[PDB]
Amino acid sequence: SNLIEVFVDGQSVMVEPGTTVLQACEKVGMQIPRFCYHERLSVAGNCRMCLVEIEKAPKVVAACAMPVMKGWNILTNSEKTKKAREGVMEFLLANHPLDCPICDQGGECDLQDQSMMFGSDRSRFLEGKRAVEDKNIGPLVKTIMTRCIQCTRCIRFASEIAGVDDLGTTGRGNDMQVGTYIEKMFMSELSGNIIDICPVGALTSKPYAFTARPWETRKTESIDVMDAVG
Amino acid sequence: ASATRFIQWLRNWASGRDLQAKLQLRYQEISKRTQPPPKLPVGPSHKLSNNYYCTR
Numbered sequence: 181s182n183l184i185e186v187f188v189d190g191q192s193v194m195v196e197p198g199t200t201v202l203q204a205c206e207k208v209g210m211q212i213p214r215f216c217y218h219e220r221l222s223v224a225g226n227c228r229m230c231l232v233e234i235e236k237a238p239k240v241v242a243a244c245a246m247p248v249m250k251g252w253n254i255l256t257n258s259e260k261t262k263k264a265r266e267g268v269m270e271f272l273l274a275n276h277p278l279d280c281p282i283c284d285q286g287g288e289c290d291l292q293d294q295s296m297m298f299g300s301d302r303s304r305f306l307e308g309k310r311a312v313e314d315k316n317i318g319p320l321v322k323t324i325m326t327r328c329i330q331c332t333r334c335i336r337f338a339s340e341i342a343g344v345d346d347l348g349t350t351g352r353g354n355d356m357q358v359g360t361y362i363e364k365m366f367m368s369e370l371s372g373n374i375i376d377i378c379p380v381g382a383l384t385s386k387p388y389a390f391t392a393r394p395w396e397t398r399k400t401e402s403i404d405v406m407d408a409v410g
Numbered sequence: 411a412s413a414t415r416f417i418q419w420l421r422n423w424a425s426g427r428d429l430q431a432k433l434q435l436r437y438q439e440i441s442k443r444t445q446p447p448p449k450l451p452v453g454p455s456h457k458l459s460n461n462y463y464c465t466r
């Protein structure tokens with residue numbers, strides 16, 4: 181009654197038709213490294229990190245794009261899948277500044293956790309590194325666009341859910357700046373969520389700025405007051 | 411007497427051969443400030459091509 185039997189590393193799993201490769205892997209317990217995909221946001225194949233090789237295929241498909249059909253043996257720990265993750269990680273960090281001490285995000289950073297586990301130990305890189313002029317977005321959100329990995333997640337956030345339409349890609353190749361072209365002071369509702377949407381230290385809270393690192397502060401669960409929804 | 415010539419005969423006489431290898435023994439071949447700045451060699455990595463973590 182609308183269920184497809186497919187294999188993740190040779191293990192049987194039942195899924196609804198229309199679901200993505202990453203959605204099927206979440207059912208068994210697997211988690212493919214990602215940068216664009218979000219549970220609440222839409223689907224885009226920008227970064228091409230969530231590469232997972234399915235057998236009897238010449239090219240490796242992304243976990244974002246492909247919907248699961250009948251009869252697929254998704255191999256997560258094959259020789260080509262490991263080389264795909266190690267490859268793109270080196271491309272992502274070739275044009276990204278050495279800012280981990282001056283970065284507002286510490287242990288929470290998505291680039292840090294993934295590059296240690298999935299990426300290579302050393303980089304081939306010798307010469308390059310692009311530098312991006314920072315744009316003052318608002319007094320609530322500090323913006324250093326040098327660290328941005330042009331993942332296109334905040335642009336989708338402002339367009340589809342926030343519904344403000346200010347952020348956008350301008351330029352081609354290396355010279356691509358994420359943000360408002362007209363230098364407009366972006367202030368609206370849900371603007372304090374775009375700091376949490378961004379996986380890297382490109383967008384961060386200006387009132388918080390620098391106080392503690394993610395690992396240093398002890399987390400405690402509470403319901404927020406002074407709000408109707410709670 | 412504090413003269414080394416006569417004393418060296420006494421210490422050699424009283425059980426076992428001495429003369430060489432003193433108690434202090436920090437006179438010659440003790441290099442101060444170690445050496446001129448050296449270059450530390452790299453292992454089987456560092457040199458590019460076929461340096462995948464899939465193999466390692």
Ligand code: SF4
Nearest residue numbers: 279280283289380381
């Ligand atoms: S975004 Fe992550 S990897 Fe990049 S400088 Fe900040 S902490 Fe380091």
Ligand code: SF4
Nearest residue numbers: 328329331332334378
């Ligand atoms: S600012 Fe952050 S969320 Fe926006 S495109 Fe860059 S990395 Fe992605």
Ligand code: FES
Nearest residue numbers: 215216227228244
């Ligand atoms: S996370 Fe799937 S393409 Fe970027």
